């Protein structure tokens, strides 16, 4: 069923809450035993958001390999994503260790450091060229190279150095700065513009490690970004664009991380973004 007609049918019937609860009921439940070990309590931002054991990213160290991060792998679309929480004061070094070890080119940030008057993640990148950051626990150095501030997002060029080997890499930081403190954006135009800028950079392409995507918990806004990207790529690759079922794609993604799409409003916004984005994919 063409999703645009499914959309108008749910909107006229006002059944978004009902569709959303159906997804919550059918979603996968896998063990998260490593996340719940007492040694890992200060590595989790939220007690109720954990990576499944089967899909968690492992740090390359014998001490403690744990980070709150999941690998979402899609075969047909040919895309992989790492979804993670906003880093904590004691996990900023683990965060950059993961980017290094997984060979990521891009970091996608969908939150502000402060929202609703509370801290939603650590200040984990340098704000001035001449004031670099050193992460002594993981032996990494991070330098701000350049910053491009636009109305709806900022793009930063960062240099990450492995102090152990003196290898360096360029990391691109894509920061969506205008998601509202409450609800979802009224139009998906600025979110789709941002998605297309990440795509254009090479950050989502198979010659690199998976993109790292985060918000505060790494399930809500983060879920919306990967769901929209994958659905638009499937509409491109297939003979029948209309064959794409956004609810079935979301359930596939929830096999790899719990809780993706946190509200019925986030589900409606994801539909809007895919419907409006398809009017480019199909030749405009
Ligand atoms: C029917 O489900 C298919 C197609 N997908 C939905 C698009 O209609 S999927 O790409 O999310 C996917 C992912 C893993 C396994 C199977 C599937």
Ligand 1 pocket (Cβ < 6 Å) reads 74, 76-77, 234, 243-245, 248-249, 252
Work out whether strand 106-109 and strand 69-74 pair parallel, antiparallel, or are unpaired: unpaired
- The answer on whether 216 is annotated among ligand-binding residues is yes
Looking from the CA of residue 74, the nearest atom of ligand 1 is 13
**Cβ–Cβ < 8 Å for 68, 45:** yes
Angle, to 10 degrees, between the axis of helix 264-281 and the axis of helix 189-200?
60
50-to-39, 54, 62, 110, 162 alpha-carbon distances in Å: 14, 12, 21, 19, 28
Reading the block at residue 217, the tokens are 């918990």
Mutate which of 81, 223, 236, 252 to test ligand 1's pocket (most atoms within 8 Å of Cβ)? 252
Say which residues have a Cβ less than 8 Å from residue 263's Cβ, sequence separation at least 6: 20, 184, 220
- Structure determination method: X-ray
Contacts with 228 (C-beta within 8 Å, 6 or more apart), sequence order: 191, 192, 195, 270, 273, 274, 277
Task: Tell me the DSSP string of the chain.
Answer: --HHHHHHHHHHHT-HHHHHHHHHHHS-----HHHHSGGGGGG-S-TT----TTTBPPPS-SS----SEEEEEETTTTEEEEEEPPPPTTTHHHHHHHHHHHTB-EEEE-S-SEETTEE-S---S-SSTTS-EEETTTTEEEEEEEEEE-SSEEEEEEEEEETTTTEEEEEEEEEE----SSS--S-SHHHHHHHHHHHHTTTTSTTSBPEEEESSSSSSHHHHHHHHHHHHHHHHHSS-GGG--HHHHHHHHTTTSTT-S-SHHHHHHHHHHHHHHHHHHTT-
Which residues lie below 8 Å from residue 5, measured CB to CB, with a gap of 6+?
none
CA distances from 149 to 128, 173, 177, 276 (A): 14, 12, 10, 25
Q: What is the stated resolution of the deposited model, in angstroms?
A: 1.8
Domains and CATH numbers, the chain: 1-283 (3.90.190.10)
């Amino acid at each position: 069923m063409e999703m645009e007609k499914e959309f108008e049918q749910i909107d006229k019937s006002g059944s978004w809450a009902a569709i959303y609860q159906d997804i919550r009921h059918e979603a996968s439940d896998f063990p998260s035993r490593v996340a719940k070990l007492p040694k890992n309590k200060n590595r989790n931002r939220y007690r109720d958001v954990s990576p499944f054991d089967h899909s968690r990213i492992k740090l390359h160290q014998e001490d403690n390999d744990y980070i709150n991060a999941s690998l979402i792998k899609m075969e047909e679309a040919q895309r992989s994503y790492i979804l993670t929480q906003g880093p904590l004061p004691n996990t900023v070094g683990h965060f950059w260790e993961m980017v290094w070890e997984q060979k990521s080119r891009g970091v996608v940030m969908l939150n502000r450091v402060m929202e609703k008057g509370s801290l939603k993640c650590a200040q984990y990148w340098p704000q001035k060229e001449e004031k670099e950051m050193i992460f002594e626990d993981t032996n990494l150095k991070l330098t701000l190279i350049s910053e491009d501030i636009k109305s709806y997002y900022t793009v930063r060029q960062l240099e990450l150095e492995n102090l152990t080997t003196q290898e360096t890499r360029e990391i691109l930081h894509f920061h969506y700065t205008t998601w509202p403190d409450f609800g979802v954006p009224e139009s998906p135009a600025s979110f789709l513009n941002f998605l297309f800028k990440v795509r254009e950079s090479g950050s989502l392409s198979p010659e690199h490690g998976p993109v790292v995507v985060h918000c505060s918990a790494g399930i809500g806004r983060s879920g919306t970004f990967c769901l929209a990207d994958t659905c638009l790529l499937l509409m491109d690759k297939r003979k029948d664009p209309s064959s794409v079922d956004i609810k079935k794609v979301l359930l596939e993604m929830r096999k790899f991380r719990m809780g993706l799409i946190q509200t019925a409003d986030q589900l409606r916004f994801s539909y809007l973004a895919v419907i409006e984005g398809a009017k480019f994919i199909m030749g405009d």
